[PDB]
Amino acid sequence: VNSFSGYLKLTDNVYIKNADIVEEAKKVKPTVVVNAANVYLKHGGGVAGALNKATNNAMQVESDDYIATNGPLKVGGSCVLSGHNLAKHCLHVVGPNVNKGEDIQLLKSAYENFNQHEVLLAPLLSAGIFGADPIHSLRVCVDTVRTNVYLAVFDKNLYDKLVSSFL
Numbered sequence: 001v002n003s004f005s006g007y008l009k010l011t012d013n014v015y016i017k018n019a020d021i022v023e024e025a026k027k028v029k030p031t032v033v034v035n036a037a038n039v040y041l042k043h044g045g046g047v048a049g050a051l052n053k054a055t056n057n058a059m060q061v062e063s064d065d066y067i068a069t070n071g072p073l074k075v076g077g078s079c080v081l082s083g084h085n086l087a088k089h090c091l092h093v094v095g096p097n098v099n100k101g102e103d104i105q106l107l108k109s110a111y112e113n114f115n116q117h118e119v120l121l122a123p124l125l126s127a128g129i130f131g132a133d134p135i136h137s138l139r140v141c142v143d144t145v146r147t148n149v150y151l152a153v154f155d156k157n158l159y160d161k162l163v164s165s166f167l
C-alpha cells in the first residue's frame, strides 16, 4: 500500500489520473518522479520547466553540473538526480522529440528506464510538446513498463480521451 490517491487502474501495474505532475509530486513526495527531459537537461518548458520552476531552479543547477561532468544523455536514455522538494529522486528520461525528427521507436527504450524503479510518478513520454501521439505513448508504456507507474495527465480533455480509447 502506497500513498497515491484517485488513480484509475488500467492494468496490473499502470495507473492514471487527471493531474498536474508538479501538484501531484508536492502532495505525494514519491520516491521517484520522472522528468520529460531532453539530452541537454535544459528544463525550459512542459514537465521539465514546471518541475524545474517548482524547485526554484535547483533542478537546473544540478543538471548543468551533471552535463558539465558527463556530457549529454542519449535519446532513449536517463539519469537519476535529486528530486529536490518534489521527490526523493528525479529520473530524467529522454523520449524522442518528434518535432526534432527523432525515431519514435526510441520511445520503448525510453520507457524501459522505468523498469529500474519499483514505483514511479510519471508523465506520458514524447507527448505534449515532444510531438508524438499520447494514445501511442500510453500503449508503449503499458506494453513496456513492468514496475508500478502512476501516470499524471495534465490535460483533462486528453485524460478522458486516453481512458475512453484504452484497449
Ligand SMILES: O=C(CSc1nnn[nH]1)c1c[nH]c2ncc(Br)cc12
Binding pocket: 019, 020, 021, 022, 046, 047, 050, 123, 124, 127, 128, 129, 152, 153, 154, 155, 158
Ligand atoms: O506538458 C506536459 C506533458 S504532455 C500532457 N500530459 N497530460 N496532458 N498533456 C505536462 C504533463 N504534466 C504536466 N504538469 C504540469 C505542466 Br505546467 C505540464 C505538464
